[PDB]
Amino acid sequence: ILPVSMTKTSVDCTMYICGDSTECSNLLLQYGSFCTQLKRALTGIAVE
Amino acid sequence: TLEILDITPCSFGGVSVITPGTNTSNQVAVLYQGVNCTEVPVAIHADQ
């Protein structure tokens, strides 16, 4: 028995940490591309 | 006034776009993850 693949998971960073709050999103983009890096990293796992 | 109302979310931040390459063409196809084709106008509030 040999595992071949995991389960792909994708997360929306803005929705995860700033729920239903536009003011939170106004502060999130101030942090920078930290959210983008996490999303891009999971994309490579998913396509792998 | 005592009145029970359902709250359907209208914030779908996850959109996947299929492009054949800007150089090749501008035509694009949009994919929504895990949604019916009837709730798309409600989910992304296409009216606004």
Curated annotation (Swiss-Prot), chain A:
Cysteine pairs forming cystine bridges in this chain are: 13-35, 18-24
Superkingdom assignment = Viruses
User: What job does the chain carry out?
Assistant: Precursor of the fusion protein processed in the biosynthesis of the S protein and the formation of virus particle. Mediates fusion of the virion and cellular membranes by functioning as a class I viral fusion protein. Contains two viral fusion peptides that are unmasked after cleavage. The S2/S2' cleavage occurs during virus entry at the cell membrane by host TMPRSS2 or during endocytosis by host CSTL.
* Name listed for the protein in its UniProt record: Spike protein S2
Task: Provide the species name.
Answer: Severe acute respiratory syndrome coronavirus 2 (2019-nCoV)
Q: What is the lineage of its organism?
A: Viruses, Riboviria, Orthornavirae, Pisuviricota, Pisoniviricetes
Swiss-Prot record, chain B:
Q: Which residues are glycosylated?
A: 23, 36
The protein's job, in short, is: Attaches the virion to the cell membrane by interacting with host receptor, initiating the infection. The major receptor is host ACE2. When S2/S2' has been cleaved, binding to the receptor triggers direct fusion at the cell membrane. When S2/S2' has not been cleaved, binding to the receptor results in internalization of the virus by endocytosis using host TFRC and GRM2 and leading to fusion of the virion membrane with the host endosomal membrane. Alternatively, may use NRP1/NRP2 and integrin as entry receptors.
What is said about its interaction partners and assembly?
Binds to host ACE2. RBD also interacts with the N-linked glycan on 'Asn-90' of ACE2. Cleavage of S generates a polybasic C-terminal sequence on S1 that binds to host Neuropilin-1 (NRP1) and Neuropilin-2 (NRP2) receptors. Interacts with host integrin alpha-5/beta-1 (ITGA5:ITGB1) and with ACE2 in complex with integrin alpha-5/beta-1 (ITGA5:ITGB1). May interact via cytoplasmic c-terminus with M protein. May interact (via N-terminus) with host bilirubin and biliverdin, thereby preventing antibody binding to the SARS-CoV-2 spike NTD via an allosteric mechanism.
* Descriptive protein name: Spike protein S1
- From which lineage does this chain's organism come? Viruses, Riboviria, Orthornavirae, Pisuviricota, Pisoniviricetes
User: What gene is this protein a product of?
Assistant: S
Describe which stretch of the whole protein the shown chain covers, with first residue, last residue and complete length.
581 to 628 of 1273
